[PDB]
Design a protein around this nucleic acid. Sequence first.
DNA 1: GCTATAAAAGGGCA
DNA 2: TGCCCCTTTATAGC
Length: 187
Amino acid sequence: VDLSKHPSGIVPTLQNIVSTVNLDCKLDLKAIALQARNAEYNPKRFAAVIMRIREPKTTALIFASGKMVCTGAKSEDFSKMAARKYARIVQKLGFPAKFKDFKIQNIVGSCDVKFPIRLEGLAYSHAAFSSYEPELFPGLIYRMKVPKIVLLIFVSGKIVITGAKMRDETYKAFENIYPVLSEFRKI
DNA sequence: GCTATAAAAGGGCA
DNA sequence: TGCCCCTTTATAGC
């Protein structure tokens, strides 16, 4: 375990990657929904072809403008491999799709500090960063400014870390919050 | 299943 | 302008 990059000794696990790419070419969404297989389309509910592949396990949102959203991957590279596979499926349907401006847009991670947390005390002493309303949602919402990352912190000690575009931002946010969480361990 | 969080995308609607 | 449509994923108490 690289304690130079993770002084806490804990490495958050990447759970979800959102990326975007531009095929540059215009698409016929209705025709794609007829020819492609694992593909749904209902334009009066949403203006995109929803397509899924098995490996990497992802879901694509494909728009008539040529833009594509890839969701569900476990790593930045699985997200790119998936986006290329969808773009290849689009190319085998008669469309001159390209792979322009691929970009990681969101990285979701999670981890466990292995001790309970007094969420109320954390919200009290960090009122400017925290939103905690247990009657609405059992997790405390921590809006970290540097880096700009949102953390969902639970009594169990599990944490959700979302909003990063580089994984180092996921790790840095967790390393910033870890000594704060230790200050609010529950008996 | 709701409740909450981030992000991208487009049509539809006050 | 602002928002939900819509997709993903962890987390957990209604």
